[PDB]
Ligand binder design. Sequence first.
Ligand SMILES: Nc1ncnc2c1ncn2[C@@H]1O[C@H](COP(=O)(O)OP(=O)(O)O)[C@@H](O)[C@H]1O
Ligand SMILES: Nc1ncnc2c1ncn2[C@@H]1O[C@H](COP(=O)(O)OP(=O)(O)O)[C@@H](O)[C@H]1O
Ligand SMILES: Nc1ncnc2c1ncn2[C@@H]1O[C@H](COP(=O)(O)OP(=O)(O)O)[C@@H](O)[C@H]1O
Ligand SMILES: OC[C@H]1O[C@H](O)[C@H](O)[C@@H]1O
Ligand code: NA
Ligand code: NA
Lengths: 306, 306
Amino acid sequence: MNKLVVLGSVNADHVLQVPSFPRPGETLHGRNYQVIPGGKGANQAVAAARMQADVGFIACVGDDSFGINIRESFKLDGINTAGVKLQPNCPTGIAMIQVSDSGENSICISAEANAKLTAAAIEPDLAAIRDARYLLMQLETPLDGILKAAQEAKTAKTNVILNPAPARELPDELLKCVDLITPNETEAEVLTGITVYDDSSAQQAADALHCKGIEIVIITLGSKGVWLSQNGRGQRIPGFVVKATDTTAAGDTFNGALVTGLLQEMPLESAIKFAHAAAAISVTRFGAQTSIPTRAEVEAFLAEHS
Amino acid sequence: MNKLVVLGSVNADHVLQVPSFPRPGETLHGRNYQVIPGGKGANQAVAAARMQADVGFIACVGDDSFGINIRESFKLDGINTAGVKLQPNCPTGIAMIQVSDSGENSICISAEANAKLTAAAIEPDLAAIRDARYLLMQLETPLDGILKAAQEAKTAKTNVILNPAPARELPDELLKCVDLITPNETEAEVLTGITVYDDSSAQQAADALHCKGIEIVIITLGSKGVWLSQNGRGQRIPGFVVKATDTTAAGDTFNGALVTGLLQEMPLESAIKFAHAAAAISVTRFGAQTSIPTRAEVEAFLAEHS
Ligand SMILES: Nc1ncnc2c1ncn2[C@@H]1O[C@H](COP(=O)(O)OP(=O)(O)O)[C@@H](O)[C@H]1O
Ligand SMILES: Nc1ncnc2c1ncn2[C@@H]1O[C@H](COP(=O)(O)OP(=O)(O)O)[C@@H](O)[C@H]1O
Ligand SMILES: Nc1ncnc2c1ncn2[C@@H]1O[C@H](COP(=O)(O)OP(=O)(O)O)[C@@H](O)[C@H]1O
Ligand SMILES: OC[C@H]1O[C@H](O)[C@H](O)[C@@H]1O
Ligand code: NA
Ligand code: NA
């Protein structure tokens, strides 16, 4: 039984580098087309695995060559893939991504095989969810599956960590079942209606989430670090500062590393610094899973930048 | 020796429907992802092959699965692929097409393997250009290859048809070598500096091209048909009235069908009307080569509309 179970998406990222971002009327010319392993589910699982978590992944891939191959690749990163299902007659999920020279990115996804991860589909994985200490999920798979999983985790002393990405509204039945939520600035506002722009508004958004029954709130603020709130008490924990090559998967890397830090008994503020270091390194590198650093690299970073 | 040679681009069109225009930041949920074979060169060669032209294609594709596979597919279409190069360590050209529900689309294109279609690259194809009756080209590959091909054809008495798409300015050196040019309204403006408001200005645009040495000018006018000018004699030839849902391959279909009609000894005006029918069928269908009709379909359409 893995101490960490990640449930979420797997995508093939179809990525182009762009000078700027498209305007409705003109054709943008890109370069360096690459197909890169991605998906928020897989990114966070690979981040946790590389941070040396005891990690099992619950997901759906397609029966295309990409899907078969990437499921095998997860094993090489030490992920337990018992719960990664191959979906007949379905492509693996995709993302079309454009990354500018500033590191900014635009991402559009299509569910494909990810749509198959329903509540029914995770019936054989309910045991793994129970025996785990932490369950980490995002919002790139069907809501019914995410809800069932969170419900099952609460009957079995499993911490539920939700990265509510990409942004969408969520039912109270789910939020009350989440022990720690990690929205970004956009997602915090979608979830609460409270735009986050400063300390007081950060704390408003967080309080709104606390009222929804979520004990720990972490609002990620890009290069500004994060806003950590623990039932009413908020504070900014700054990140590390680096030149951005590509921020795709920065958030995923942060989440996978954070849960790993927590699992490995680092106090919450320490696990956040640890997660900041992993995420900062990933910001300096291109592509989703290709940017995710190893534990050794994260330690070296922390040794340098204390 | 093929009577028709097409020289031009090959793209994999990656198409996604999205709710809003893609912006940097939050990931957008899309839907209905498809990879459709595309590129102006391939679309025109496929159009001609489907209309049963005796056609060879000169192009560069990648050594990805898409490029390997499409070259084989072209063969099944009836296209001579001797001049189709697979470029090592290089993906096929791609167009990332994001079709927003809100009306305006986002398009990002990367040349990839298309950039390898240079003046030097087509050296082994010069014999086929000399031996053809018509050479059909567009502007989605490097100008040096286009120019080399046009010069070779000129000294061989091969008719050169240039579809000047996507729009860009062209040197007198290239235009002098063109026998028939098929700009749309936007392209006619880019080439001449003359904006096409009506018939009089369409003729203005046409005579600007005649003055660059082009005997026949066809300005396509969307739903308004075509402005034909032969050595200074202009007229409007209307198209067909249909429910247009996707004009993505309309100009490509028109050009492929036009030259095939000409190769069949249809009088020019008649070939233009025949090509209107082919293009009309295409605008009622979705995607690049997926919209391109066969000769049998065009005949049924014409029978039904007579
Ligand atoms: N420019 C940057 N420099 C250093 N660290 C960054 C940078 N951008 C993001 N990070 C790290 O990545 C995490 C996620 O940040 P963010 O980009 O806000 O994610 P999202 O795009 O989902 O909002 C941050 O908490 C921080 O650790
Ligand atoms: N702005 C654009 N929109 C759609 N496709 C484009 C665009 N620019 C280039 N392309 C490429 O051109 C092909 C679209 O066909 P196109 O050549 O535009 O047809 P038409 O001859 O009707 O203009 C697509 O298959 C795609 O690969
Ligand atoms: N709405 C339409 N209805 C019928 N035929 C059309 C329509 N739009 C384009 N066509 C056909 O497609 C041909 C391509 O011309 P045009 O549409 O101007 O080029 P493009 O759309 O590729 O820029 C036209 O000459 C005409 O035959
Ligand atoms: O967070 C980054 C990821 O979001 C999208 O799901 C892409 O697959 C990309 O890898
Ligand atoms: Na990165
Ligand atoms: Na069409």
